[PDB]
Amino acid sequence: MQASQFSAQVLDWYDKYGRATLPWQIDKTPYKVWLSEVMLQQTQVATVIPYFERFMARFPTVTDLANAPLDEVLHLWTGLGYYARARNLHKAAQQVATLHGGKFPETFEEVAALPGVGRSTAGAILSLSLGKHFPILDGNVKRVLARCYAVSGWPGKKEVENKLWSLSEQVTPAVGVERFNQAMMDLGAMICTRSKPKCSLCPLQNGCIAAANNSWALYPGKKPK
């Protein structure tokens, strides 16, 4: 299906089934989306929710986070795992306070320059909180795109990653980007699951190659070895 149809079908689906109840999806700000993306990186959403709230209550602004002792930040992080994220989070907060006057940057270069923030995360922060025209490519998106467009290579390979980034850019619209990007992550997390995807509940089922061939297990490709 055309890229235009892809985004339209995804947005229509999101309007009907979209659930934006999470704390970081309400009254969004770059700071809140950033904080949530880092916590959600390697931790289940159910587990994250209470921590997000505790962090927002203790650190209303990025400057409050920056000024706090690293040890307190690490203590509040206890239970989320992968503490390297917490250390980069604090450094990023300090960078924002030092280089951007306490105002979380709203430009791609400046956001991506932050420790612990990559290309996809920077795009998610700006698109979700400000509606900036940037695509994302997390585990969820890679799976949906790989299956819909039959990209069987291992994303760990540069050429395959570039291919997926191009597909994401191609289907990602400017109008409604905030809803489209959140929709794609929701689709990849709740519908197009790693195992036995629920294609009958997927807005892309009519044009998805994996669905047509019942070959979802082939996309994305797994690390060769």
Q: Which residues are catalytic?
A: 37
User: Count of CB atoms within 10 A of residue 158's CB?
Assistant: 8
Q: Between residue 28 and residue 87, which ones bind ligand SF4 under the rule CB under 6 A?
A: none
Rounded to a whole number of angstroms, the minimum distance from the CB of residue 125 to ligand SF4 is 25
Q: What is the DSSP letter of 222?
A: P
148 is in an annotated binding site: no
Nearer to ligand SF4, 6 or 55 (CB): 6
User: C-beta of 1: minimal distance to ligand SF4 in Å?
Assistant: 11
CA distance 161 to 152: 11
User: Which of 86, 128, 148, 183 lies at the binding interface for ligand SF4 (CB under 6 A)?
Assistant: 148
Count of residues that bind ligand SF4 according to CB under 6 A: 14
Helices (H), 18-107: 30-40, 45-58, 62-67, 70-77, 84-99
State which of positions 181-220 bind ligand SF4 (CB under 6 A): 191-192, 197, 199, 202, 204-205, 208, 210-211, 216
Is 131 in contact with 178 (CB distance < 8 Å)?
A: yes
The span from the CA of 31 to the CA of 49, in Å, is 16
Q: How far is CA 50 from CA 10, 22, 30, 77, 175, in A?
A: 29, 11, 19, 11, 32
> Which residues fall in the annotated binding site for [4Fe-4S] cluster?
192, 199, 202, 208
Give the footprint of ligand SF4 on this chain (CB under 6 A).
144, 147-148, 191-192, 197, 199, 202, 204-205, 208, 210-211, 216
